[PDB]
């Protein structure tokens, strides 16, 4: 057995993969409020044709989030079109 369990972040997976299929994971703010000490900023992840989106929180978790998404479907649906 291998001793020294690793995980790498939904943030960092997601988008340095990106790179790979020449596309990059977008986020963008759909709507923010501000009512209390920790906003809701909910940030859109668009990859390829997988579109995801991350509200609850502010960039702090909703951005992990919002990548988190894209990543899980990245292995299930396992983007990858055909030719004909």
Same mark, same amino acid.
Do not use: W
């Given at each position: ?8 972040? =939904? $943030? %960092? !997976? ?8 020449? &596309?990059? =994971? !977008?986020?963008e703010?759909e709507r923010?409020? !501000? %009512? $209390?000490? !920790? =906003?809701?900023?909910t940030f859109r992840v ?5 579109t995801c989106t991350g509200e ?6 909703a951005?992990?989030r919002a990548?988190?998404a894209? $990543? &899980?479907?990245?292995?299930? &649906?396992?983007?990858? =079109?055909?030719?004909?």
């Amino acid at each position: 057995g291998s001793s020294g369990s690793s995980g790498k972040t =939904p $943030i %960092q !997976v997601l988008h340095e993969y990106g790179m790979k299929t020449k &596309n990059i =994971p !977008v986020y963008e703010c759909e709507r923010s409020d !501000v %009512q $209390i000490h !920790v =906003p809701t900023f909910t940030f859109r992840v668009t990859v390829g044709d997988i579109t995801c989106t991350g509200e609850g929180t502010s960039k702090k978790l909703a951005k992990h989030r919002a990548a988190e998404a894209a $990543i &899980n479907i990245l292995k299930a &649906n396992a983007s990858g =079109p055909s030719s004909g």
